[PDB]
Paper text:
Polycomb repressive complex 2 (PRC2) is an essential chromatin regulator that harbors histone methyltransferase (HMTase) activity mediated by its catalytic subunit enhancer of zeste homolog 2 (EZH2). PRC2 is the only known factor that establishes the trimethylation of lysine 27 of histone H3 (H3K27me3), a chromatin mark associated with transcriptional repression and whose tight spatiotemporal regulation is essential during development and differentiation. In addition to EZH2 (or its less active homolog EZH1), the core PRC2 complex consists of suppressor of zeste 12 (SUZ12), retinoblastoma-associated protein 46 or 48 (RBAP46/48), and embryonic ectoderm development (EED). The binding of EED to trimethylated-lysine-bearing peptides is central to PRC2 activity since it allosterically activates EZH2, a requirement for efficient trimethylation of H3K27.2 Upon engagement of specific methylated peptides by EED, a flexible loop of EZH2, the stimulatory-response motif (SRM), folds into a short α-helix and stabilizes an active conformation of EZH2 by bridging the EED ligand binding site and the critical SET-I helix of the EZH2 catalytic su(var), enhancer-of-zeste, and trithorax (SET) domain.
Cryo-EM analysis of automethylated PRC2 incubated with nucleosomes containing 40 bp stretches of linker DNA on both sides resolved two distinct species: nucleosomes bound by a single PRC2 complex and two PRC2 complexes interacting with one nucleosome and with each other in a non-symmetrical dimer. In contrast to other recently described symmetric PRC2 dimers, the two PRC2 complexes are arranged asymmetrically, with only one of them contacting the histone octamer in a way that is compatible with H3 methylation. We refer to this PRC2 as nucleosome-proximal PRC2 (PRC2prox) (blue). The second PRC2 is located distal from the histone core (referred to as PRC2dist) (orange) and interacts distinctly with each of the two DNA linkers, as well as with the PRC2prox. In the PRC2prox, the SET domain of EZH2 engages the substrate H3 tail while its CXC domain contacts the nucleosomal DNA, as previously seen. In addition to their interactions with the nucleosome, the PRC2dist and PRC2prox interact with each other via two different interfaces. The EZH2dist lacks density that would correspond to the bridge helix, indicating that the am-loop containing the automethylated K510, K514, and K515 is unfolded. The SET domain of EZH2dist is positioned close to EEDprox such that the automethylated lysines within the unfolded am-loop of EZH2dist can easily reach the allosteric methyl-lysine binding pocket of EEDprox. Our studies led us to discover a chromatin-dependent PRC2 dimer in which the automethylated am-loop of a PRC2dist binds the allosteric site in EED of a PRC2prox that is engaged with the tail of the substrate nucleosome.
Residue numbers in the entry:
A (entry chain S): 27 to 122
B (entry chain R), G (entry chain U): 12 to 119
C (entry chain J): 20 to 102
D (entry chain W): 37 to 135
E (entry chain X): 16 to 102
F (entry chain A): 68 to 135
H (entry chain V): 28 to 122
Write the structure that this text describes.
């Protein structure tokens, strides 16, 4: 009992009930999603650091993340991704 | 008062609670906005949804019910935009999509 | 068959199987000396990066984390092992 | 009876001369007139600084010329001195640009 | 017209001798006639990828003019880099 | 295993390997060669040749850009 | 009172004071070591000294006293160790290295 | 007005350390200015990433030494390392 580590285990497992309520997923398959989601998180945030740097600003807010995912994700992925985030911020600011 | 998470507040699943603290140590800027992790958390929800939705779609064709790590390769390399996002990306125990060149086939 | 250059460890059929996955119809005789070279140099660079990460941590054991991070530098990012 | 050159001789002169020289090879205005045309498809008549058009050109030509380095090298491999489209399709596909 | 312009025939400005000269710097003897239109498309494809990324920086900083600074950065995203414009 | 242990011993001695770390090299390499062989075949098909020849790879690696 | 810049302290014509500041500003680490920027300042120095010499080496070859962008193109490209370090970059007005294939030459 | 920055002076000082007879064109200098800015962003990049995985929040000469180990080929690496340690030892004498 030591080294409590951080993984996205329950979250990917719980969100998968959206598309297939009953299908399971392998424990090794848990790690690839752990590696994939973590990988994309690095690249989006890593991009955001530069855009704030270019304009010489000290805060990361919705706008630059909005353009960050508009650069990194090609095609129509961003369009719904903008849509998903747009709903995401509205719910938070409505219940603030 | 009463303790309730921000994920329920913003009506999504991915951890706006953890993304905040992790992004604070992430060394990306001096400050991170309150709305920064919420807007981000949807994008992980969106990306995880389609990848697993296609992972779920591939599984039903192979009659299996557990998502084999192979199934991801057989789903990621069929959506050109998702392929483009992971074009230079290899996945362990992945195999490759089935394909054979036209000329290599028998003449008749 | 005493111990020799272990690049001969990857066998004549084993390379052919690797080609088959790549949609290869016919294999020339001389391809085999080349595939050792390219597999040698590619696997040379990765470990050299991989070893240096271990040097920095002072750990004498190469870890899975280091190899994954060595791959990212070459742009050949790898999933499924962590981080 | 007027003196001529065998076909291809003018090329080899025009190759060595153009490798020696370093200037941009496309007339500025046709390139300038095109880049605004592409941009206006995305927003409302964005103003380009005179430095930007040149800088946008330098990367493109160097990228474009690097493509012929790959395309011609494959074309030699197919025992043809000529260049062909089924080369230029194959050139980028190993590059992973089209992937 | 006082404002706005018509967008047409712009790819036609990349004339056939211009395509020759670009191939010349790379180094070739014979160029097929069919290359002329297609490589124009390749230039169209490459250019629109980088300029669209470049515009998004201009949109981000709220400005309405495109500069050399963003284009330097936009190239940096697409695995290319150019020196000589204050990157 | 014997290949990677001997080659790494050039750079430093007394190395130990996590058994998970070794297969990380294996899966990475097999993905790399298989990616190399697919594109190498394309060039062979271009030359109107059913089989591949060693001269295709140096072209295959050169176009990619990491070798020449 | 009797000040001397850190570049003067190491006698190295690189911003040992300023490079130390840029490390803090870029959010690369929470702390930056006392010897940390000093080590990097030389690293840029040696790297730029070697590239500049080869450009200067090229400058006398073309019989020109002023280094233009072209002389940079030669220095980066002719030496492959810099070339592989710069395999993703291009230089404005750099041009292309003078070369031609044997097959492209006339048949004699 | 409009105070901006560059490294034009410092590279120019480096040239006369080597070839005092020759000058530099304006366009050439900005390439070197961008270049040394490029290498700076790269060396800081893997240096910062290195400290993160090691669960260390301080960047010192060691990470840079590892950073230059990775980024440059062997021949550049061993020369840069020798220059790197030489600089620190002169600094550490009267730090």
């Amino acid at each position: 009992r030591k080294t409590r580590k951080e993984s996205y285990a329950i979250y990917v497992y719980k969100v998968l009930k959206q598309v297939h309520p009953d299908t399971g997923i392998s424990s090794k398959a848990m790690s690839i999603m752990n590696s994939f989601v973590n990988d994309v998180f690095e690249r989006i945030a890593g991009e955001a650091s530069r855009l704030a740097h270019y304009n010489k600003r000290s805060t990361i807010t919705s706008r630059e993340i909005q353009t960050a995912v508009r650069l990194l994700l090609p095609g129509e992925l961003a369009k719904h991704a903008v849509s998903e985030g747009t709903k995401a911020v509205t719910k938070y600011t409505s219940a603030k | 008062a009463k303790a309730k998470t921000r994920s329920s507040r913003a009506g999504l699943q991915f951890p706006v609670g953890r993304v905040h603290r992790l992004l604070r140590k992430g060394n990306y800027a001096e400050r991170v906005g309150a709305g920064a992790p919420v807007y981000l958390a949807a994008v992980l929800e969106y990306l995880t949804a389609e990848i697993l939705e296609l992972a779920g779609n591939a599984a039903r064709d192979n009659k299996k019910t557990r998502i084999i790590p192979r199934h991801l390769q057989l789903a990621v390399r069929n959506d050109e935009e998702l392929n483009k996002l992971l074009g230079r990306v290899t996945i362990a125990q992945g195999g490759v999509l089935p394909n054979i060149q036209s000329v290599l086939l028998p003449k008749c | 068959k005493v111990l020799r250059d272990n690049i001969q460890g990857i066998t004549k059929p084993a390379i052919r199987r690797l080609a088959r996955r790549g949609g290869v119809k016919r294999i020339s005789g001389l391809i085999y000396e080349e595939t050792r070279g390219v597999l040698k140099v590619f696997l040379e660079n990765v470990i050299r990066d991989a070893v240096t990460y271990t040097e920095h941590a002072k750990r004498k054991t190469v870890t899975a984390m280091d190899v994954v991070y060595a791959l990212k530098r070459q742009g050949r990012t790898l999933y499924g092992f962590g981080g | 009876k007027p003196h001529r050159y065998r076909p291809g001789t003018v090329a080899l002169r025009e190759i060595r001369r153009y490798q020696k020289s370093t200037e941009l090879l496309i007339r500025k205005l046709p390139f300038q007139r095109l880049v605004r045309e592409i941009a206006q498809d995305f927003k409302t008549d964005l103003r380009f600084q005179s430095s930007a058009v040149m800088a946008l050109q330098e990367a493109s030509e160097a990228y474009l010329v690097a493509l012929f380095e790959d395309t011609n090298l494959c074309a030699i491999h197919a025992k043809r001195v000529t260049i062909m489209p089924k080369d230029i399709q194959l050139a980028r596909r190993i590059r992973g640009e089209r992937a």
